[PDB]
């Protein structure tokens, strides 16, 4: 039935830096799905196929690297999520013009919703198609403004989600931002003094594919990269022009494949064109991902930007605002450089935006919500959907106001 029947989730615990490199390269050459990188003090998670389980733990054993079996068959966890999301969708009063926060919405429902918003709120909302995905799907975003992007004195705040299609919890967060800026405006300063760009579904082809098929897919759906298309798709968070190809995979079978060149994919190209059009006054750029409970910045390569101190300061302000309203079960937000906290990475969206436009640019890593069955992962429990949105919006508005208050530059 599933391509995940027999797949197991492992937790790798590394003691030193020597092992961080060891485990990292091994995972890459075996082309494993690395959910989170291993580092001393915070063990990582990796999805290992049934036909590679013996080879995988064989290497760790002879290398002296601790590991241990979290989930023997991820299929059971996938089937539960379907069961939990299916029941939430049945009880939901969600409609075409009003998407609720009690279920996960598909690409089609988000696409229709955006268009309905521009009919009911034409003075502040403007729906625009930034382009077409590889498989031809229409990728549209919102431009929220009371001055119709006409007053160039107002700063712009860009926000996006679903770049990695399997990170489903990112969509609620960006959808909540639309809800508070359009539907339920309780804070007039955020709409009057700031112009907003929101892109809900940055990877429509992958997102649709994760809905009926490969749940754990993250790349886009680009073909023509291998004979008979045995392997396909490009990691869009490695396809951006900031130091492209320096810290990513060269194999199309890898989940971190950078592509032919920088902005070779249509999904990343459309984002580039949006950034370019508004680079003259873009104050803040946010690439919302899942999973980690961290706010990162920098440049994936380790080198820090000139305004590093300012970047970290605003990051801490956004983190503290989220931690003040968090779930007791969940942990506090981490702040820092991308290279320092996780691992070397290039071609990232937030890095490029920083280089061509926003003085302040972060990559959000939303919390992995735990429950009775699963722990940390990409699966969504319908009870965290609203909290995921509300929690993040606390950090976003604090950041938007703080970043906008950098009109002293």
Shortest Å distance, C-beta 291 to Zn ion: 8
Classified as helix, coil or strand, 287 is strand
Does 289 appear as a known binding residue? Answer: yes
Given the complex with Zn ion, which of 179 and 289 has the nearer CB atom? 289
| Rounded-to-integer distance, Cα 174 and Cα 213, Å | 24
List Cα–Cα distances, 185 to 34, 114, 118, in angstroms.
Answer: 40, 17, 16
Strand partners, 47: 9, 33
- Specify the pairing of strand 156-161 against strand 282-289: parallel
Given the complex with Zn ion, which of 164 and 215 has the nearer CB atom? 164
Shortest Å distance, C-beta 176 to Zn ion: 19
Classified as helix, coil or strand, 253 is coil
| Rounded-to-integer distance, Cα 172 and Cα 195, Å | 20
Shortest Å distance, C-beta 350 to Zn ion: 11
Q: Collect all residues with Cβ–Cβ distance below 8 Å to 347 and sequence separation of at least 6.
A: 235, 237, 238, 239, 240, 241, 242, 243, 244, 245, 247, 248, 258, 262, 300
Shortest Å distance, C-beta 407 to Zn ion: 31
Given the complex with Zn ion, which of 155 and 395 has the nearer CB atom? 395
Given the complex with Zn ion, which of 164 and 238 has the nearer CB atom? 164
**Residue tagged active-site, from 27, 81, 365, 391:** 365
Are the beta carbons of 105 and 171 closer than 8 angstroms? yes
| Rounded-to-integer distance, Cα 252 and Cα 223, Å | 10
Place of tokens 């101190």: 309
Which secondary structure element, helix H or strand E, spans residue 47, and what is its range? Answer: strand 44-48
Are the beta carbons of 339 and 350 closer than 8 angstroms? no
Catalytic residue check, 365: yes
Given the complex with Zn ion, which of 162 and 182 has the nearer CB atom? 162
Q: How many residues does the chain have?
A: 409
Are the beta carbons of 177 and 393 closer than 8 angstroms? yes
Given the complex with Zn ion, which of 124 and 165 has the nearer CB atom? 165
Sheet of 138-144: strands edge to edge?
A: 127-132, 138-144, 195-199, 156-161, 282-289, 360-365, 294-297, 334-337
Classified as helix, coil or strand, 96 is coil
Residue 232 token pair: 């396909």
Shortest Å distance, C-beta 365 to Zn ion: 8
Q: Collect all residues with Cβ–Cβ distance below 8 Å to 207 and sequence separation of at least 6.
A: 106, 107, 162, 165, 201
Shortest Å distance, C-beta 289 to Zn ion: 4
Residue 140 token pair: 């549209």
| Rounded-to-integer distance, Cα 157 and Cα 143, Å | 10
Binding site for Zn ion (CB under 5 A): 164, 289
> Alpha helix locations (H) across 232-307?
266-277
Given the complex with Zn ion, which of 221 and 289 has the nearer CB atom? 289
Shortest Å distance, C-beta 164 to Zn ion: 4
Residue numbering of the annotated binding site = 289
Kindly list the catalytic residues: 365
Residue numbering of the annotated binding site for Zn(2+) = 289
């Amino acid at each position: 039935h599933e391509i995940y029947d027999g797949h197991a989730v492992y937790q790798v615990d590394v003691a030193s830096m020597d092992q961080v490199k060891l485990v990292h390269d091994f995972e890459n050459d075996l082309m494993l799905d690395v959910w989170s990188d291993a580092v001393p003090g915070r063990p990582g998670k990796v999805l290992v196929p049934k036909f590679k389980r013996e080879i995988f733990e064989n290497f760790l054993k002879q290398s002296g690297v601790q590991y241990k079996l979290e989930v023997e068959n991820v299929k059971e966890q996938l089937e539960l999520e379907d069961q939990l999301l299916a029941a939430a969708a049945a009880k939901s009063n969600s409609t075409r013009s009003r998407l609720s926060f009690d279920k996960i919405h598909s690409y089609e429902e988000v696409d229709a919703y955006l268009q309905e918003l521009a009919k009911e709120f034409p003075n502040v909302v403007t729906v625009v198609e930034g382009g077409k995905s590889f498989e031809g799907r229409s990728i549209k975003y919102l431009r929220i403004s009371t001055t119709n992007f006409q007053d160039a004195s107002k700063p712009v705040v860009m926000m996006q989600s679903l770049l990695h299609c399997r990170e489903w919890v990112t969509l609620p967060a960006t959808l909540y931002a639309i809800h508070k800026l359009v539907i339920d405006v309780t804070e007039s300063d955020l709409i009057n003094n700031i112009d907003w760009i929101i892109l809900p579904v940055a990877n429509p082809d992958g997102y649709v594919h994760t809905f009926g098929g490969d749940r754990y897919w993250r790349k886009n759906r680009a073909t023509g990269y291998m004979a008979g298309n045995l392997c396909m798709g490009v990691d869009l968070n490695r396809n951006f022009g900031m130091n492209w190809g320096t810290a990513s995979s060269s194999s199309v079978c890898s989940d971190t494949f950078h592509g032919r060149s920088a902005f070779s994919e249509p999904e990343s190209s459309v984002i580039r064109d949006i950034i370019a059009e508004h680079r003259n006054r873009m104050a803040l750029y946010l690439d919302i991902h899942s999973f980690g409970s961290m706010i990162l910045y920098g440049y994936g390569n380790g080198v820090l930007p000139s305004n590093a101190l300012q970047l970290h300061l605003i990051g801490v302000q956004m983190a503290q605002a989220i931690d003040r309203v968090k779930w007791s079960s969940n942990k506090d937000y981490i702040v820092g450089n991308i290279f320092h906290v996780l691992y070397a990475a290039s071609g990232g969206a937030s890095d490029y935006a920083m280089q061509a436009a926003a003085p302040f640019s972060y990559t959000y890593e939303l919390p992995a919500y735990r429950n009775s069955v699963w722990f940390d992962g990409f699966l969504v429990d319908p009870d965290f959907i609203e909290q995921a949105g509300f929690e993040t919006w606390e950090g976003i508005k604090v950041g938007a106001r703080a970043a906008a208050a950098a009109a002293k530059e």
